[PDB]
Amino acid sequence: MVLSEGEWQLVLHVWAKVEADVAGHGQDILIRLFKSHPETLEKFDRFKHLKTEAEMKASEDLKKHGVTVLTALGAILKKKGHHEAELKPLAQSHATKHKIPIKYLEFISEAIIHVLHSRHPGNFGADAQGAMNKALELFRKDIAAKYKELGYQG
Ligand code: HEM
């Protein structure tokens, strides 16, 4: 897959709106993931005790981890597909330490798309949605290929 230049423009234009409140977006994405797919919370030893959404929102450490996640993701998107070097340390930890199947990346992709709609009702159009889905799909496919290069089945 390949994005057009105009699609990357839409992606980066939307990302500038994420960067204006990274913690608010990161916390919302994690909570959306955990409510929609509670099997994913069990991978997080530090947060697995959180049970209701109200608990999650008051957890300072969950919000900080949201920043960690979106910070890494934004660095990758900003490379517009030339991201082999940023992917490697990410692929290495999530395949071999955290043991995250690629299916869980699809789930966080859907959570990102939902939170962008919830947080930007008027800005996040169909074309922007399309471009973001493609950027995230590319991310998932290249990470699945790095899994295999490390000898893992994602
Ligand atoms: C956009 C997708 C994602 C990005 C950019 C991302 C990024 C990161 C980063 C930067 C870290 C900290 C350092 C590290 O261990 O690598 C981390 C930790 C972690 N990630 Fe992810 N991640 C993503 C998706 C996921 C998903 C979907 C899961 C599981 C459902 C997951 C599971 C974990 C776990 C379990 C840790 C360790 C948490 C801790 O500090 O105790 N990641 N991630």
Residue numbers in the entry: 1 to 154
Which of the paper's sentences describe this entry?
The crystals on chip 1 were SWMb-CO in space group P212121, while the crystals on chip 2 were SWMetMb in space group P6. While a desire to minimize the absorbed dose (though defocusing and attenuating the X-ray beam in the case of chip 1 and reducing the exposure time in the case of chip 2) resulted in a relatively low signal-to-noise level, the indexing and scaling of data was not problematic and the data extended to 1.9 Å resolution or better in each case. Even though this is an encoded move, we added a small dwell time (1 ms) at each position to ensure that the position is reached and the sample is stationary for data collection. These travel and dwell times mean that the total time taken to collect data from every position on a chip (11 664 locations, as this includes fiducial positions) was 10 min when 40 ms was used as the exposure time (chip 1) and 7 min when using an exposure time of 25 ms (chip 2). Chip 1 resulted in 2576 indexed images, representing a hit rate of 22%, while chip 2 resulted in 4264 indexed images (a hit rate of 37%). In each case sufficient data were obtained from a single chip for structure solution. The maps obtained from chip 1 show that even a modestly loaded chip provides sufficient data for structure solution. Here, in the low-dose SWMb-CO example, each crystal is subjected to a dose of 51 kGy, which is significantly less than the ‘safe dose’ of 80 kGy measured for these crystals using UV–Vis absorption spectroscopy. Serial approaches therefore provide a means of obtaining low-dose, low-damage room-temperature structures at synchrotrons.
